[PDB]
Symmetry: C3
Subunit: 151 residues, 3 copies
Protein backbone atom coordinates (compact mmCIF):
# COMPACT_ATOMS: atom_id res chain seq x y z
CA UNK A 1 0.00 0.00 0.00
CA UNK A 2 3.07 2.17 0.60
CA UNK A 3 4.51 1.61 -2.89
CA UNK A 4 0.98 2.38 -4.09
CA UNK A 5 0.82 5.67 -2.19
CA UNK A 6 4.26 6.51 -3.62
CA UNK A 7 3.27 5.71 -7.20
CA UNK A 8 0.18 7.92 -6.94
CA UNK A 9 2.39 10.62 -5.45
CA UNK A 10 4.69 10.47 -8.49
CA UNK A 11 1.75 10.56 -10.91
CA UNK A 12 0.80 13.95 -9.52
CA UNK A 13 4.36 15.28 -9.57
CA UNK A 14 4.83 14.10 -13.12
CA UNK A 15 1.50 15.58 -14.22
CA UNK A 16 2.65 18.88 -12.73
CA UNK A 17 6.04 18.75 -14.49
CA UNK A 18 4.43 17.99 -17.85
CA UNK A 19 1.97 20.89 -17.55
CA UNK A 20 4.61 23.38 -16.35
CA UNK A 21 7.10 22.29 -19.01
CA UNK A 22 4.45 22.51 -21.73
CA UNK A 23 4.05 26.22 -20.97
CA UNK A 24 7.78 26.89 -20.83
CA UNK A 25 8.29 25.22 -24.21
CA UNK A 26 6.09 27.95 -25.75
CA UNK A 27 7.85 30.70 -23.81
CA UNK A 28 11.26 29.42 -24.91
CA UNK A 29 10.46 29.33 -28.64
CA UNK A 30 9.26 32.92 -28.52
CA UNK A 31 10.48 34.78 -30.57
CA UNK A 32 13.52 32.97 -32.01
CA UNK A 33 12.49 29.35 -32.26
CA UNK A 34 10.39 27.12 -34.47
CA UNK A 35 9.25 23.63 -33.59
CA UNK A 36 8.55 21.21 -36.42
CA UNK A 37 8.02 17.55 -35.53
CA UNK A 38 10.79 16.47 -33.15
CA UNK A 39 13.18 19.12 -34.50
CA UNK A 40 13.60 22.65 -33.17
CA UNK A 41 15.14 25.47 -35.21
CA UNK A 42 16.49 28.41 -33.23
CA UNK A 43 18.23 31.48 -34.53
CA UNK A 44 20.99 33.28 -32.66
CA UNK A 45 19.61 36.48 -34.14
CA UNK A 46 22.81 37.54 -35.92
CA UNK A 47 24.85 36.78 -39.05
CA UNK A 48 28.19 34.99 -39.37
CA UNK A 49 30.34 33.32 -42.06
CA UNK A 50 29.63 29.60 -42.55
CA UNK A 51 32.54 28.14 -40.57
CA UNK A 52 31.77 30.39 -37.58
CA UNK A 53 28.04 29.66 -37.73
CA UNK A 54 28.75 25.93 -37.96
CA UNK A 55 30.98 26.12 -34.89
CA UNK A 56 28.34 27.95 -32.86
CA UNK A 57 25.73 25.29 -33.60
CA UNK A 58 27.96 22.28 -33.03
CA UNK A 59 29.44 23.60 -29.79
CA UNK A 60 25.87 24.24 -28.59
CA UNK A 61 25.12 20.55 -29.09
CA UNK A 62 23.24 20.90 -32.34
CA UNK A 63 24.08 21.73 -35.94
CA UNK A 64 23.24 24.24 -38.67
CA UNK A 65 19.66 24.14 -39.96
CA UNK A 66 19.19 21.02 -42.12
CA UNK A 67 15.60 20.94 -43.45
CA UNK A 68 14.84 17.40 -44.68
CA UNK A 69 11.25 17.95 -45.79
CA UNK A 70 8.95 20.63 -47.16
CA UNK A 71 7.54 20.97 -43.65
CA UNK A 72 10.93 21.55 -42.02
CA UNK A 73 11.86 23.99 -44.75
CA UNK A 74 8.62 25.92 -44.25
CA UNK A 75 9.31 26.09 -40.50
CA UNK A 76 12.87 27.33 -41.10
CA UNK A 77 11.52 29.85 -43.60
CA UNK A 78 9.34 31.41 -40.88
CA UNK A 79 12.47 32.32 -38.87
CA UNK A 80 14.21 33.68 -41.96
CA UNK A 81 11.12 35.77 -42.75
CA UNK A 82 10.80 36.89 -39.13
CA UNK A 83 14.40 38.11 -39.03
CA UNK A 84 14.32 39.16 -42.70
CA UNK A 85 17.74 37.59 -43.14
CA UNK A 86 18.69 34.71 -45.44
CA UNK A 87 20.20 31.90 -43.36
CA UNK A 88 22.92 29.34 -43.83
CA UNK A 89 21.97 25.68 -44.11
CA UNK A 90 24.34 22.94 -42.92
CA UNK A 91 24.96 21.44 -46.36
CA UNK A 92 27.96 22.04 -48.61
CA UNK A 93 29.63 20.53 -51.66
CA UNK A 94 33.07 21.33 -50.23
CA UNK A 95 34.27 17.73 -50.53
CA UNK A 96 33.07 17.02 -54.07
CA UNK A 97 31.91 19.93 -56.25
CA UNK A 98 28.30 19.50 -57.32
CA UNK A 99 27.58 16.91 -54.63
CA UNK A 100 25.87 18.50 -51.64
CA UNK A 101 25.90 16.58 -48.37
CA UNK A 102 24.98 16.96 -44.70
CA UNK A 103 27.71 17.41 -42.02
CA UNK A 104 27.71 13.60 -41.84
CA UNK A 105 28.49 13.08 -45.53
CA UNK A 106 25.04 11.79 -46.45
CA UNK A 107 23.44 12.98 -49.70
CA UNK A 108 20.48 15.35 -49.68
CA UNK A 109 17.09 13.70 -49.07
CA UNK A 110 15.31 16.99 -49.81
CA UNK A 111 16.17 20.22 -51.60
CA UNK A 112 14.35 23.41 -52.56
CA UNK A 113 16.75 24.96 -55.04
CA UNK A 114 15.80 28.18 -56.78
CA UNK A 115 15.69 27.64 -60.58
CA UNK A 116 19.19 27.20 -62.00
CA UNK A 117 20.77 26.55 -58.60
CA UNK A 118 23.19 25.37 -57.50
CA UNK A 119 25.35 27.18 -60.06
CA UNK A 120 28.72 27.45 -58.28
CA UNK A 121 28.91 31.11 -59.35
CA UNK A 122 32.47 32.27 -59.99
CA UNK A 123 33.49 28.70 -59.28
CA UNK A 124 33.35 29.49 -55.58
CA UNK A 125 29.94 28.64 -54.03
CA UNK A 126 30.07 25.60 -51.75
CA UNK A 127 27.61 26.63 -49.05
CA UNK A 128 23.83 26.98 -49.14
CA UNK A 129 21.52 29.79 -48.06
CA UNK A 130 17.75 29.80 -47.74
CA UNK A 131 15.86 32.95 -48.80
CA UNK A 132 12.77 34.53 -47.25
CA UNK A 133 10.79 32.80 -50.01
CA UNK A 134 12.13 29.47 -48.76
CA UNK A 135 14.17 28.78 -51.89
CA UNK A 136 17.80 27.67 -51.73
CA UNK A 137 20.89 29.08 -53.43
CA UNK A 138 24.50 27.95 -53.19
CA UNK A 139 26.67 30.73 -51.86
CA UNK A 140 30.26 31.48 -50.88
CA UNK A 141 30.91 30.15 -47.39
CA UNK A 142 32.80 33.34 -46.61
CA UNK A 143 29.57 35.33 -46.82
CA UNK A 144 27.75 36.19 -43.58
CA UNK A 145 24.24 34.78 -43.16
CA UNK A 146 21.72 34.36 -40.35
CA UNK A 147 22.82 31.68 -37.89
CA UNK A 148 20.05 29.14 -37.34
CA UNK A 149 20.76 25.87 -35.53
CA UNK A 150 18.66 22.76 -35.18
CA UNK A 151 18.28 20.75 -32.00
Amino acid sequence: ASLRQQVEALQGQVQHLQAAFSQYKKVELFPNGQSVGEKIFKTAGFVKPFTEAQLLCTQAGGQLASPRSAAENAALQQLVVAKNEAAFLSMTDSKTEGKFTYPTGESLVYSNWAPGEPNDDGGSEDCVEIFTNGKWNDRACGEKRLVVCEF
Copy 2:
Protein backbone atom coordinates in the same frame (compact mmCIF):
# COMPACT_ATOMS: atom_id res chain seq x y z
CA SER B 1 11.99 -5.44 -8.01
CA LEU B 2 9.10 -2.95 -8.05
CA ARG B 3 10.42 -1.28 -4.89
CA GLN B 4 13.75 -0.95 -6.68
CA GLN B 5 12.23 0.62 -9.82
CA VAL B 6 9.94 2.93 -7.83
CA GLU B 7 12.96 4.30 -5.93
CA ALA B 8 14.77 4.88 -9.23
CA LEU B 9 11.73 6.65 -10.66
CA GLN B 10 11.37 8.79 -7.53
CA GLY B 11 14.96 9.89 -7.94
CA GLN B 12 14.28 10.69 -11.59
CA VAL B 13 11.30 12.86 -10.72
CA GLN B 14 13.19 14.67 -7.94
CA HIS B 15 16.07 15.34 -10.34
CA LEU B 16 13.66 16.72 -12.94
CA GLN B 17 11.95 18.96 -10.39
CA ALA B 18 15.28 20.47 -9.38
CA ALA B 19 16.57 20.79 -12.95
CA PHE B 20 13.29 22.27 -14.27
CA SER B 21 13.16 24.80 -11.45
CA GLN B 22 16.65 26.00 -12.36
CA TYR B 23 15.79 26.05 -16.07
CA LYS B 24 12.74 28.21 -15.38
CA LYS B 25 14.90 30.92 -13.79
CA VAL B 26 17.31 30.80 -16.71
CA GLU B 27 14.54 31.07 -19.31
CA LEU B 28 12.91 34.09 -17.64
CA PHE B 29 16.23 35.92 -17.47
CA PRO B 30 16.13 38.73 -18.65
CA ASN B 31 13.02 38.97 -20.85
CA GLY B 32 10.29 37.24 -18.89
CA GLN B 33 8.21 37.75 -15.78
CA SER B 34 6.27 35.07 -13.99
CA VAL B 35 3.15 36.23 -12.19
CA GLY B 36 0.78 33.62 -10.85
CA GLU B 37 0.18 31.07 -13.59
CA LYS B 38 0.93 33.65 -16.28
CA ILE B 39 4.24 34.46 -17.93
CA PHE B 40 4.94 37.73 -19.72
CA LYS B 41 7.79 37.64 -22.21
CA THR B 42 9.09 40.45 -24.36
CA ALA B 43 10.39 39.85 -27.89
CA GLY B 44 12.85 42.64 -27.16
CA PHE B 45 11.82 44.78 -30.14
CA VAL B 46 8.97 47.06 -31.27
CA LYS B 47 6.23 46.45 -33.84
CA PRO B 48 2.88 48.03 -34.78
CA PHE B 49 -0.20 46.48 -33.15
CA THR B 50 -1.27 44.12 -35.94
CA GLU B 51 2.25 42.69 -36.35
CA ALA B 52 2.79 42.37 -32.59
CA GLN B 53 -0.56 40.63 -32.18
CA LEU B 54 0.28 38.15 -34.94
CA LEU B 55 3.65 37.46 -33.34
CA CYS B 56 2.03 36.45 -30.06
CA THR B 57 -0.79 34.34 -31.50
CA GLN B 58 1.66 32.49 -33.75
CA ALA B 59 3.79 31.76 -30.68
CA GLY B 60 0.78 30.13 -29.06
CA GLY B 61 0.01 33.05 -26.78
CA GLN B 62 -1.42 36.57 -27.03
CA LEU B 63 -0.39 40.18 -26.37
CA ALA B 64 0.10 41.23 -22.73
CA SER B 65 -3.34 41.30 -21.07
CA PRO B 66 -2.87 42.33 -17.41
CA ARG B 67 -6.04 41.52 -15.48
CA SER B 68 -4.97 42.73 -12.06
CA ALA B 69 -2.63 45.14 -10.31
CA ALA B 70 -0.29 42.21 -9.71
CA GLU B 71 -0.07 41.27 -13.39
CA ASN B 72 0.30 44.92 -14.35
CA ALA B 73 3.29 45.30 -12.01
CA ALA B 74 4.94 42.23 -13.52
CA LEU B 75 4.39 43.51 -17.07
CA GLN B 76 5.56 46.98 -16.04
CA GLN B 77 8.80 45.40 -14.78
CA LEU B 78 9.56 44.30 -18.34
CA VAL B 79 8.57 47.73 -19.69
CA VAL B 80 10.91 49.48 -17.25
CA ALA B 81 13.76 47.07 -18.08
CA LYS B 82 13.59 47.65 -21.84
CA ASN B 83 12.70 51.32 -21.29
CA GLU B 84 9.93 51.05 -23.88
CA ALA B 85 6.17 51.34 -23.56
CA ALA B 86 4.44 48.15 -24.66
CA PHE B 87 1.23 47.30 -26.47
CA LEU B 88 -1.49 45.57 -24.49
CA SER B 89 -3.94 43.20 -26.16
CA MET B 90 -7.06 45.32 -25.57
CA THR B 91 -8.72 47.57 -28.15
CA ASP B 92 -11.98 49.44 -28.73
CA SER B 93 -11.75 48.81 -32.48
CA LYS B 94 -15.18 47.14 -32.48
CA THR B 95 -17.12 49.68 -30.43
CA GLU B 96 -15.44 53.05 -29.86
CA GLY B 97 -15.11 53.86 -26.16
CA LYS B 98 -15.44 50.22 -25.14
CA PHE B 99 -12.15 48.41 -24.75
CA THR B 100 -12.21 44.63 -24.87
CA TYR B 101 -9.89 41.63 -24.71
CA PRO B 102 -9.18 39.70 -27.93
CA THR B 103 -11.98 37.24 -27.11
CA GLY B 104 -14.51 40.07 -26.89
CA GLU B 105 -15.03 40.30 -23.13
CA SER B 106 -15.03 43.71 -21.46
CA LEU B 107 -12.07 44.69 -19.31
CA VAL B 108 -12.08 43.30 -15.77
CA TYR B 109 -9.29 45.64 -14.72
CA SER B 110 -7.82 48.86 -16.04
CA ASN B 111 -5.00 51.20 -15.08
CA TRP B 112 -5.64 54.21 -17.31
CA ALA B 113 -3.55 57.32 -16.80
CA PRO B 114 -5.57 60.47 -15.95
CA GLY B 115 -7.92 61.46 -18.76
CA GLU B 116 -7.42 58.23 -20.71
CA PRO B 117 -8.73 56.72 -22.88
CA ASN B 118 -9.25 59.93 -24.87
CA ASP B 119 -9.26 58.71 -28.50
CA ASP B 120 -6.91 61.53 -29.46
CA GLY B 121 -7.44 62.74 -33.02
CA GLY B 122 -10.34 60.31 -33.15
CA SER B 123 -7.93 57.47 -33.95
CA GLU B 124 -6.66 55.73 -30.80
CA ASP B 125 -8.04 52.19 -30.53
CA CYS B 126 -5.01 50.40 -29.10
CA VAL B 127 -3.50 50.48 -25.59
CA GLU B 128 0.06 51.11 -24.46
CA ILE B 129 1.46 50.65 -20.97
CA PHE B 130 4.04 53.17 -19.78
CA THR B 131 7.13 52.54 -17.69
CA ASN B 132 5.06 53.88 -14.78
CA GLY B 133 2.53 51.11 -15.33
CA LYS B 134 -0.28 53.42 -16.47
CA TRP B 135 -2.23 52.93 -19.70
CA ASN B 136 -2.98 55.22 -22.61
CA ASP B 137 -5.05 54.47 -25.68
CA ARG B 138 -2.70 54.81 -28.64
CA ALA B 139 -2.86 54.60 -32.42
CA CYS B 140 -2.63 50.96 -33.55
CA GLY B 141 -0.17 51.89 -36.28
CA GLU B 142 2.37 53.11 -33.73
CA LYS B 143 5.35 50.88 -32.87
CA ARG B 144 5.54 49.61 -29.28
CA LEU B 145 7.45 46.95 -27.35
CA VAL B 146 6.10 43.50 -28.16
CA VAL B 147 5.22 41.54 -25.03
CA CYS B 148 3.22 38.32 -25.15
CA GLU B 149 1.69 36.31 -22.32
CA PHE B 150 1.69 32.52 -22.03
Copy 3:
Protein backbone atom coordinates in the same frame (compact mmCIF):
# COMPACT_ATOMS: atom_id res chain seq x y z
CA ALA C 1 0.88 -6.57 -11.20
CA SER C 2 -1.42 -3.56 -11.58
CA LEU C 3 1.28 -1.49 -9.86
CA ARG C 4 4.14 -2.95 -11.90
CA GLN C 5 2.41 -1.85 -15.10
CA GLN C 6 1.74 1.56 -13.55
CA VAL C 7 5.42 2.00 -12.72
CA GLU C 8 6.36 0.89 -16.23
CA ALA C 9 4.00 3.44 -17.75
CA LEU C 10 5.12 6.31 -15.51
CA GLN C 11 8.78 5.59 -16.20
CA GLY C 12 8.21 5.80 -19.94
CA GLN C 13 6.49 9.14 -19.38
CA VAL C 14 9.37 10.32 -17.20
CA GLN C 15 12.11 9.21 -19.55
CA HIS C 16 10.28 10.89 -22.41
CA LEU C 17 10.16 14.05 -20.29
CA GLN C 18 13.89 13.64 -19.56
CA ALA C 19 14.54 13.55 -23.32
CA ALA C 20 12.29 16.55 -24.04
CA PHE C 21 13.81 18.53 -21.20
CA SER C 22 17.35 17.73 -22.31
CA GLN C 23 16.52 19.01 -25.78
CA TYR C 24 14.88 22.20 -24.51
CA LYS C 25 17.82 22.87 -22.20
CA LYS C 26 20.22 22.83 -25.17
CA VAL C 27 17.89 25.13 -27.10
CA GLU C 28 17.61 27.47 -24.11
CA LEU C 29 21.36 27.87 -23.68
CA PHE C 30 21.84 28.80 -27.34
CA PRO C 31 23.37 31.37 -27.87
CA ASN C 32 23.50 33.23 -24.53
CA GLY C 33 24.02 30.53 -21.93
CA GLN C 34 26.78 28.14 -20.91
CA SER C 35 26.33 25.14 -18.64
CA VAL C 36 29.24 23.80 -16.60
CA GLY C 37 28.70 21.08 -14.02
CA GLU C 38 25.46 21.96 -12.24
CA LYS C 39 25.94 25.68 -12.81
CA ILE C 40 24.46 27.74 -15.63
CA PHE C 41 25.88 31.04 -16.81
CA LYS C 42 23.56 33.27 -18.84
CA THR C 43 24.27 36.73 -20.21
CA ALA C 44 21.62 39.44 -20.36
CA GLY C 45 23.21 40.67 -23.58
CA PHE C 46 23.81 44.22 -22.33
CA VAL C 47 26.13 46.18 -20.03
CA LYS C 48 25.36 47.80 -16.68
CA PRO C 49 27.33 49.22 -13.74
CA PHE C 50 28.07 46.61 -11.05
CA THR C 51 25.24 47.49 -8.66
CA GLU C 52 22.58 47.37 -11.37
CA ALA C 53 24.07 44.16 -12.80
CA GLN C 54 24.07 42.56 -9.33
CA LEU C 55 20.42 43.49 -8.74
CA LEU C 56 19.38 42.04 -12.10
CA CYS C 57 20.91 38.68 -11.18
CA THR C 58 19.60 38.55 -7.61
CA GLN C 59 16.10 39.53 -8.71
CA ALA C 60 16.29 36.73 -11.32
CA GLY C 61 16.96 34.23 -8.54
CA GLY C 62 20.67 33.96 -9.17
CA GLN C 63 23.81 36.03 -8.74
CA LEU C 64 26.59 37.59 -10.79
CA ALA C 65 28.95 35.12 -12.44
CA SER C 66 31.20 33.56 -9.79
CA PRO C 67 33.69 31.23 -11.52
CA ARG C 68 35.10 28.94 -8.82
CA SER C 69 37.32 26.74 -10.99
CA ALA C 70 39.29 26.83 -14.23
CA ALA C 71 36.43 24.91 -15.85
CA GLU C 72 33.80 27.45 -14.77
CA ASN C 73 36.00 30.34 -15.84
CA ALA C 74 36.46 28.73 -19.26
CA ALA C 75 32.68 28.38 -19.67
CA LEU C 76 32.13 31.98 -18.63
CA GLN C 77 34.88 33.15 -20.98
CA GLN C 78 32.94 31.63 -23.89
CA LEU C 79 30.08 34.09 -23.29
CA VAL C 80 32.43 37.04 -22.87
CA VAL C 81 34.15 36.03 -26.12
CA ALA C 82 30.86 35.48 -27.97
CA LYS C 83 29.57 38.92 -26.97
CA ASN C 84 33.07 40.44 -27.17
CA GLU C 85 32.44 42.31 -23.92
CA ALA C 86 34.29 42.06 -20.60
CA ALA C 87 31.88 40.95 -17.88
CA PHE C 88 31.50 41.65 -14.17
CA LEU C 89 32.09 38.86 -11.69
CA SER C 90 30.24 38.85 -8.36
CA MET C 91 33.33 39.36 -6.21
CA THR C 92 34.45 42.60 -4.58
CA ASP C 93 36.94 43.76 -1.95
CA SER C 94 34.72 46.61 -0.75
CA LYS C 95 34.63 45.60 2.92
CA THR C 96 38.38 45.02 3.21
CA GLU C 97 40.68 46.40 0.51
CA GLY C 98 42.78 43.72 -1.16
CA LYS C 99 40.58 40.89 0.04
CA PHE C 100 38.16 39.78 -2.65
CA THR C 101 35.10 37.89 -1.50
CA TYR C 102 31.95 36.33 -2.89
CA PRO C 103 28.58 37.91 -2.01
CA THR C 104 28.43 35.55 1.00
CA GLY C 105 31.57 37.13 2.45
CA GLU C 106 33.59 33.98 1.77
CA SER C 107 37.17 34.40 0.45
CA LEU C 108 38.07 33.40 -3.11
CA VAL C 109 38.77 29.71 -3.72
CA TYR C 110 39.86 30.45 -7.30
CA SER C 111 41.31 33.43 -9.14
CA ASN C 112 42.61 34.15 -12.66
CA TRP C 113 44.16 37.58 -12.29
CA ALA C 114 45.90 39.07 -15.28
CA PRO C 115 49.57 39.95 -14.58
CA GLY C 116 49.81 42.95 -12.28
CA GLU C 117 46.25 42.52 -10.97
CA PRO C 118 44.50 43.27 -8.73
CA ASN C 119 46.16 46.68 -8.49
CA ASP C 120 43.40 48.92 -7.10
CA ASP C 121 44.25 51.53 -9.72
CA GLY C 122 43.40 55.08 -8.69
CA GLY C 123 42.73 53.55 -5.28
CA SER C 124 39.13 52.76 -6.23
CA GLU C 125 38.87 49.42 -8.05
CA ASP C 126 36.75 47.11 -5.90
CA CYS C 127 34.92 45.08 -8.54
CA VAL C 128 36.15 42.34 -10.88
CA GLU C 129 35.88 42.02 -14.64
CA ILE C 130 36.78 39.04 -16.79
CA PHE C 131 38.35 39.74 -20.19
CA THR C 132 37.79 37.94 -23.48
CA ASN C 133 41.04 36.09 -22.73
CA GLY C 134 39.49 34.92 -19.47
CA LYS C 135 41.89 36.87 -17.25
CA TRP C 136 40.63 39.01 -14.37
CA ASN C 137 41.17 42.66 -13.57
CA ASP C 138 39.89 44.61 -10.58
CA ARG C 139 37.74 47.36 -12.07
CA ALA C 140 35.91 50.38 -10.70
CA CYS C 141 32.38 49.28 -9.80
CA GLY C 142 30.89 52.29 -11.59
CA GLU C 143 32.05 51.11 -15.01
CA LYS C 144 29.60 49.30 -17.28
CA ARG C 145 30.36 45.65 -18.06
CA LEU C 146 28.55 42.69 -19.60
CA VAL C 147 25.90 41.33 -17.27
CA VAL C 148 26.24 37.59 -16.80
CA CYS C 149 24.34 35.73 -14.10
CA GLU C 150 24.79 32.21 -12.83
CA PHE C 151 21.94 29.94 -11.81
